[PDB]
From a paper:
The first identified human member, ClC-1, is essential for maintaining the permeability of Cl− across the plasma membrane of skeletal muscle fibers, gCl, accounting for approximately 80% of the resting membrane conductance and assuring precise neuronal control of muscle contraction. Despite distinct roles as passively conducting Cl− channels and stoichiometrically coupled secondary active Cl−/H+ antiporters, members of the CLC family share a common homodimeric core architecture, with each subunit harboring an independent ion translocation pathway. In addition, the complex gating processes that regulate CLC channel activity remain elusive, with only a single available structure of a channel member, namely, that of bovine ClC-K. Each CLC monomer has a gate that operates independently from the other (also known as “protopore” or “fast gate”), structurally attributed to a specific glutamate, “GluGATE”. Here, we have determined structures of full-length human ClC-1 using single-particle cryo-electron microscopy (cryo-EM), exploiting a purified protein sample that displays Cl−-dependent single-channel–derived ion conductance.
For structural characterization, sample in the presence of 100 mM Cl− at pH 7.5 and in the absence of nucleotides or antibodies was initially employed. Assessment of the 3 major cryo-EM maps obtained in our structural classification reveals different arrangements of the CBS domains, suggesting intrinsic domain flexibility at pH 7.5. Therefore, the CBS arrangements seem to correlate with slow gating, being rigid at low pH in the presence of nucleotides and more flexible at higher pH in the absence of nucleotides, bringing to mind a mechanism that has been proposed based on electrophysiological data. The complete effects of such putative rearrangements are, however, not demonstrated experimentally by our structures, because they remain closed also at the higher pH (determined from particles in detergent environment).
Author numbering:
A (entry chain A), B (entry chain B): 115 to 253, 262 to 591, 595 to 669, 818 to 872
């Protein structure tokens, strides 16, 4: 209702910020290609501009990473999915980092270097959620986190129900359907504003999603190449697994040597730009885009992969097609150039997300999946040139559907979900290939689940962040006896005047255990300290409402750590007062469960 | 994995049963229309066959409702959403009722009377889930219920992600994402088999969903009729609310009078068939389908409503169109016939779901929504005959999109969800109108949420079933003091030989509280009775492993009933041992919370 009105201002602001950032990104990008073309074709000088614009934007982005942001480097979803699991970092929710991130992420987005988008966008979306929650409802924690995640991804791509599925499907154990309704209304209004604002200020005609991919939708697949879809499940998951593995292969290489550690403490600025430099050394179009089509910034690149005609048959013609004219070298077969494009983007993207940058883990993987898909689609077009017959209509296959289903499959495989297929068909604009892409997505997901861990789980493992995982293993003897803390603070109601002044002057924490007597030791309830301070001081001044809430839990003192973890998971709660016979004996905290489950 | 293999046999069987039932339904239906046409046009005799086939099939269905099924009359989802909230009815999960229902539901489906499909299909899906869970994993309760719900609706309509959203979005408070993954894999394989089996035995070409609705997808909406979409939100929700209200207006009329109660105990068979009779009295095409198009069985009827051309402009021509030729009376404007169709199906469908029949609450409502949508689409086509201009292309509007978005909207409004829009676009086959249908669905949902209760909540209210609801009301003084049961059974470990033989001969229940001493009164844990029986008897025979699990909960004796309800909700648990100082004092059961929250 009126919390819906809170949500509708949230989505309005979030869509204004997203349109702003990709608008300025696209304008900087067209200015880049524009001046690059229009100065002169000078093979020293076009090389000079091809180097000197992307490295200076990435240096600018990394400067904003360094100076203003003390902790927001490498931002994304896994730290906040650890936050909603409990490990709170309020200083990491600073508004000041917010503006410090986003424009650098615009510099990240405006670069021709492959970056993701969604991750730090989800982070700033949860930032705006928390700040507006501070600003409204004065004029529930993981609820605002969850809704911020939903609004962030649905405001990236205009994909509401993919937004809410990408919000639920990993970042929880249980989930309240209230927040489902909240985030679904939020995500649909954020998606709605993002597209109509386009048709307002700029040209957009009507409301296409982003990428109208005009397929024939008349005898689409058929069911003869369908086991080929089986291959594009399993193989993608295979290679996708390797991707995550190789990311660990460089993150350990990030922090294995004292030599580069010493030189990075010596000079932090040196590391990103230079390898940006060297991948630009393989990107320059009359250098290597003769074999790479290096004049493909990724958005229009993947729009060119969704071309609804066979490029091998159009390798037979010299026709000026659309942007797919970049996909012709006049001597080299185009399967080779697609293969080289795929493998070279593949090893560049891990290096791209390696550097100390706010990096989303979705977009270049999505590009790689589209690459592999149109690869196998074009070779199946070469494999069956004949097509089939139908009533006065010869129907040959077309590789655009293969491209979009593989671009679902492989990033779903890396990301360990199925909600990626949802935003995949929602950005493709037609839902012909819906059940085969769901099949292939789940095939790749179970292969990936079998082989290698998640992307973000490997990220928090390597970054060594406090987080409770589990792998369904309850062995013989795990008991909470080396763990509980026997330091107990205590308040009684039958404590009088001097004792209560002493409690003011000796204690500091936010809420306090109330018992009957310290000799009885039995925990009874809990009272906020500051309300007691209020009652004492605002009775002291006029000189010259006591409600008792109950402790919802109690820990039987031989509980196995799996079941203890399960208890805090299903309660969604932090701490444990460990008693026998009510008499308080120990205290178990969250970080000690992590230190326990180290083994 | 191999529980996935459990799931894949489940979905294979479920899709075989669904294809079987609608195959036989369609064959009986085409035989009905076939013999009806081909005997002769005799206005007494065609009236005779028009009566005598539907009432005899409905009598047959009601006979199967009566004799074999003792409790499965009026089956659907709200009893099982009460079961997964706790109120178990194992006798209502009888396999014998299963075959006793489905063929009568086939008789329900094969009738020309408007029935739903999904509800009892969900019920038999959860039946097959439970039975296969008994059969596999010898060769977790609400998990199998939830997955059965998902498989049931996704096996109805071939709509997997709509299946899992319709499984979650009402039938829970919290939800495990494990079951999300389970049911998503299950739902996609059930949807997958349903369509490929079509292309195997019968003709199907390739894999369309059901209803390819060929729209132009080129300048689709535009954003000038978009506030008209606002109307088709709110108005539908308005009228949809009235629908649920009028259902109560007849269900009380079901059980208000002792006269019809006496005559129904006198003769139960009389009630359904005769009103079937009288709505057939308004269905006969040269009687009233001259103004109704009564020769429209509902599936091809709604396919005819998704006609991508303006029937008012084709009221200008005498052209033999497709089945839409039934939409012409040569003297009466077709807006009038659509209006009369809508209002007459509207008051017939509540009477149709009234009778003691397994009735789904989705399909005729979906028909009514499509009716209202094409109504307003045709009058907007009459309102703007000109259309707009674009580059050498004059584009006029078309009412098929209005029909499909209203057919989302109104049944989403009745059903109190948003997942209905998902299965709506997934059966339409194109996703042009995706964000406006989401907007209109949520508009109608908040109007319906504002005005009138849910369909199924009104159903369980009137049928007076034990179920804990809540309406966010925690007043001044609600306390658990008139409620707890002070009858306590007790077991000690230091009880010896004669006492343990006495415990065998005096007690009966499945698991038992273990304490230290009955004088101490403190609850310590719980042990299964039958394992103790096993240890005693299978030690007694060789004459001539004692594990202690802990009680996870304890009730502070002044807990408010809202927070008690909240405790059992978030635990998902049944009972409460109510102690002070560990010493057991009372027992609180589930039905007493319902008897409490009566006020």
């Amino acid at each position: 209702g009126e919390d819906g009105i809170f949500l509708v201002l949230l989505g309005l602001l979030m869509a204004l910020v997203s349109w702003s950032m990709d608008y300025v990104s696209a304008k900087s990008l067209q200015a880049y290609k524009w001046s690059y073309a229009q100065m002169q074709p000078s093979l020293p000088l076009q090389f000079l501009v091809w180097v000197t614009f992307p490295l200076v934007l990435i240096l600018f982005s990394a400067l904003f990473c360094h100076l203003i942001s003390p902790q927001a480097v490498g931002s994304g979803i896994p730290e906040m999915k650890t936050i909603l699991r409990g490990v709170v970092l309020k200083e990491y929710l600073t508004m000041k980092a917010f503006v410090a991130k986003v424009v650098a992420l615009t510099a990240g987005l405006g670069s021709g270097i492959p970056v993701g988008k969604e991750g730090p966008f989800v982070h700033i979306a949860s930032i705006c959620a928390a700040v507006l929650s501070k600003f409204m409802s004065v004029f529930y924690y993981s609820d605002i986190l969850t809704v911020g995640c939903a609004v962030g991804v649905g405001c990236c791509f205009g994909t509401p129900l993919g937004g809410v599925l990408f919000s639920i499907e990993v970042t929880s154990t249980y989930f309240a359907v209230r927040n489902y309704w909240r985030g679904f209304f939020a995500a649909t209004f954020s998606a709605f504003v993002f597209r109509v604002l386009a048709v307002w200020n700029k040209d957009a005609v009507t409301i296409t999603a982003l990428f109208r991919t005009n397929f024939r939708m008349d005898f689409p697949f058929d069911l003869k190449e369908l086991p080929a879809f089986a291959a594009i499940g399993i193989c993608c998951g295979l290679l996708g697994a390797v991707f995550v593995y190789l990311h660990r292969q460089v993150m350990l290489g990030v922090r294995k040597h004292k030599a580069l550690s010493q030189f990075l403490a010596k000079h932090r600025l040196l590391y990103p730009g230079i390898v940006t430099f060297v991948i630009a050394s393989f990107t320059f179009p009359p250098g290597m885009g003769q074999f790479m089509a290096g004049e493909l910034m990724p958005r229009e690149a993947i729009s060119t992969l969704f071309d609804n005609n066979t490029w091998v048959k159009h390798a037979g013609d010299p026709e000026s097609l659309g942007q797919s004219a970049v996909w012709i070298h006049p001597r080299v077969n185009v399967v080779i150039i697609i293969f080289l494009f795929f493998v070279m983007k593949f090893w560049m993207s891990i290096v791209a997300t390696t550097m100390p940058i706010p990096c989303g883990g979705f977009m270049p993987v999505f590009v790689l999946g589209a690459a592999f898909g149109r690869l196998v689609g074009e070779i199946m077009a070469m494999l069956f040139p004949d097509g089939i017959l139908f009533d006065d209509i010869i129907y040959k296959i077309l590789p655009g559907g293969y491209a979009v289903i593989g671009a679902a499959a492989l990033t779903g495989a890396v990301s360990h979900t199925v909600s990626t297929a949802v935003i995949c068909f929602e950005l493709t604009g037609q839902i012909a290939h819906i059940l085969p892409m769901m099949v292939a997505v789940i095939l790749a997901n179970m292969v990936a689940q079998s082989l290698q861990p998640s992307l973000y789980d490997s990220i928090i493992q390597v970054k060594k962040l406090p987080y409770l995982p589990w792998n369904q293993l309850s062995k013989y003897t795990i008991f909470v006896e080396d763990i509980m803390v026997r330091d107990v603070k205590f308040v009684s109601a039958s404590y009088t005047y001097g004792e209560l002044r002493t409690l003011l002057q000796t204690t500091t924490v936010k809420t306090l255990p109330l018992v009957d007597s310290k000799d009885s030791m039995i925990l009874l309830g809990s009272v906020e300290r500051s309300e007691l301070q209020a009652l004492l001081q605002r009775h002291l001044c006029p000189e010259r409402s006591c409600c008792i809430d109950q402790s919802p839990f109690q820990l039987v003192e031989q509980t196995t750590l799996h079941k203890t973890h399960t208890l805090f998971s299903l309660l969604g709660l932090h701490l444990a007062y460990v008693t026998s016979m009510g008499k308080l004996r120990g205290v178990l905290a969250l970080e000690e469960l992590q230190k326990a489950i180290e083994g």
